[PDB]
Amino acid sequence: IASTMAKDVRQFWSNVEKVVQFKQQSRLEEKRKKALDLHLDFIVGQTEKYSDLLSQSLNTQVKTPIPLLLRGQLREYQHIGLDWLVTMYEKKLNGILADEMGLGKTIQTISLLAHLACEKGNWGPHLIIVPTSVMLNWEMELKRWCPSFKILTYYGAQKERKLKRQGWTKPNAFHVCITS
């Protein structure tokens, strides 16, 4: 009888502690809510301040021409995006290009690399991570538009990958690497 009593009382106080846990969870959600809302205004304000600071140095009109490395002409929106990417680079920010599919984001990035190579003298090792289905497409687009980049397509079995990595740390071994 006393064990039944203890079980009943323990269930009752488990319900009481469940109520207390609901209370503490409601208080945490408030802290979670204000913490989420507070930092949102912080990260947002900081990002917008950095973008406004970035748009402050624009002359707007495009300043960058079609770099010498390009063998073909660039569209109007492509040239505008190239100028925007060059501004982002000059001001040391990272970029997200959300142009609709088919607008030549590949060509825009290739023109950005062309500018960095011609005017800034930086032809780095430029890593490019793309889906396995478009590695050949990126390689062909690079060979087509910018023929001066040393392209290294990182594909094949492990042994082939090791063979390609042999001596790849040397300077100027390759300019742009394309991987999946």
Partner: peptide, 20 residues
């Protein structure tokens, strides 16, 4: 480089921004 809109999840947006 993205071809789809970033309107699917605030968590995905935060991940992409933190990576940026």
């Amino acid at each position: 480089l993205t071809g789809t809109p970033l309107q699917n999840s605030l968590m995905e947006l935060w991940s992409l921004m933190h990576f940026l």
